């Protein structure tokens, strides 16, 4: 599952970290797949069967195949006992056996002399395409995203 700069996140927007891209949901929505966000349910019952209850999880509230429930959130199983710090854990389709690596917050990079965690400082060139003339690539709270550069109503940059 690979998200590109041309991915259209449904009810969401593209964010970039040191080594990857993902879709972040609008408001309080939950990821149903790598690129769509839907409304979640508060409790799992007969009326909410097979409905989204958390990111990559439906009611049975078990995580989808290939994930595992750690700290009440669904994380890939290869990211189980992998700690990163100043960043998140992801995986790449490059290796045959899926391996969990660290993708760091903007300004940080994998520190090779620190068990490949996110401690070393390093720039990351923004790869997002904010083609609208009212949006530009900004760095917010550790991630890259397209945001307004001059005036927005409350949510459109025009």
């Amino acid at each position, epitope marked *: *599952a*690979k998200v*590109t*700069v*041309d*991915t*259209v*996140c*449904k009810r969401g927007f593209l964010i970039q970290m040191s*080594g*990857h*891209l993902e879709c972040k949901c609008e408001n309080d929505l939950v990821l149903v*797949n*790598e*690129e*769509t966000c839907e409304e979640k349910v508060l409790k799992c019952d007969e009326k909410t069967v097979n409905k989204p209850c958390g990111d990559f999880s439906k009611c049975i509230c078990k995580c989808n195949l290939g994930y595992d429930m750690v700290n009440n959130v669904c994380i890939p199983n290869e990211c189980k006992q992998v700690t990163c710090g100043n960043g998140k854990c992801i995986l*790449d*389709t490059s290796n045959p056996v899926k391996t969990g690596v660290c993708s760091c917050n903007i300004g940080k990079v994998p520190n090779v002399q620190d068990q490949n965690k996110c401690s070393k400082d390093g720039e990351t*060139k*923004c*790869s*997002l*395409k*904010c*083609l609208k003339e009212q949006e530009t*690539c900004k760095a917010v709270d550790g991630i890259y995203k397209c945001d307004c550069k001059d005036g927005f109503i409350i949510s459109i940059c025009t």
Partner: antibody, heavy 125, light 111 residues
Framework: EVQLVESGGGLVQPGGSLRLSCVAS????????MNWVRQAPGKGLEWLSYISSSSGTIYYADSVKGRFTISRDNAKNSMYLQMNSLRAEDTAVYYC??????????????????WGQGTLVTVSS | DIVMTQSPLSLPVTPGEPASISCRSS??????????LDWYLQKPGQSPQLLIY???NRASGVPDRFSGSGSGTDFTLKISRVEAEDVGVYYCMQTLQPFTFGQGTRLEIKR
């Protein structure tokens, strides 16, 4: 290795319809975005359509918008292209292409790293 | 869509001497310091393979004689020393509004 096999081509009259199929082997099909690319006789490659792994992102060339529809069935490791209102200019060899995306340190880029043998579509009266 | 036009259509080259291929786009492919243009080579009886990505970067496994330059709407692929195995059709492809190929440049042997 990666093997893409196209099927569903053949003969059709102008205005008629055709449905192409592409089965993917040798890799996890549900992890890859895919393309349809054609090449008319005596012409260069013409990209037609792009589809993401979760079918949420789809693009078309202007030359096939409204007439062609792309879709995939990750369960059957297959990928389809519905072709309606076919004109003679649609006569070409149609390929399905695997689209890798590398998060390289010099920038993120696509790589059309697998191409099927193609299937021939002839639109004629 | 965005229009891509290459020149020449056929380029005869003697093995050993350099070669240039021009590619222009109907609108600027530059955004945020990236030029969204790639280069592909389709050798006879083979699949297309990526050569240059994002204007000037060689793909993993490309000889150093292949190079890409240009920005905005003006791009050029340059082979410093043409080997005989480099004959084929070269395409430039814009990735700003995926996707569009050029009409192709046929690299042939001069005799």
């Amino acid at each position: 290795e990666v093997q893409l096999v196209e099927s569903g081509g053949g003969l059709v009259q102008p205005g008629g319809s055709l449905r192409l199929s592409c089965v993917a082997s040798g890799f996890t099909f549900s992890n890859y975005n895919m393309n349809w690319v054609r090449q008319a006789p005596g012409k260069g490659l013409e990209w037609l359509s792009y589809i993401s792994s979760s079918s949420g992102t789809i693009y078309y060339a202007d030359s096939v918008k409204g007439r062609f529809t792309i879709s995939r069935d990750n369960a059957k490791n297959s990928m389809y292209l519905q072709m309606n209102s076919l004109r003679a200019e649609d006569t070409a060899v149609y390929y399905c292409v695997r689209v890798e995306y590398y998060y390289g340190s010099s920038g993120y880029y696509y790589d059309f790293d697998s191409w099927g043998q193609g299937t021939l579509v002839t639109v004629s009266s | 869509d965005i229009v891509m036009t290459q020149s020449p259509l056929s380029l005869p080259v003697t093995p050993g001497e350099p070669a240039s291929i021009s590619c222009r786009s109907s609108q600027s492919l530059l955004h945020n310091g990236y030029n969204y243009l790639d280069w592909y080579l389709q050798k006879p009886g083979q699949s297309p393979q990526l050569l240059i990505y994002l204007g000037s970067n060689r793909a993993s496994g490309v000889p150093d004689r292949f190079s890409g330059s240009g920005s905005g709407t003006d791009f050029t692929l340059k082979i410093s020393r043409v080997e005989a195995e480099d004959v084929g059709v070269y395409y430039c492809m814009q990735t700003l509004q995926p996707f569009t190929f050029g009409q192709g440049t046929r690299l042939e042997i001069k005799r």
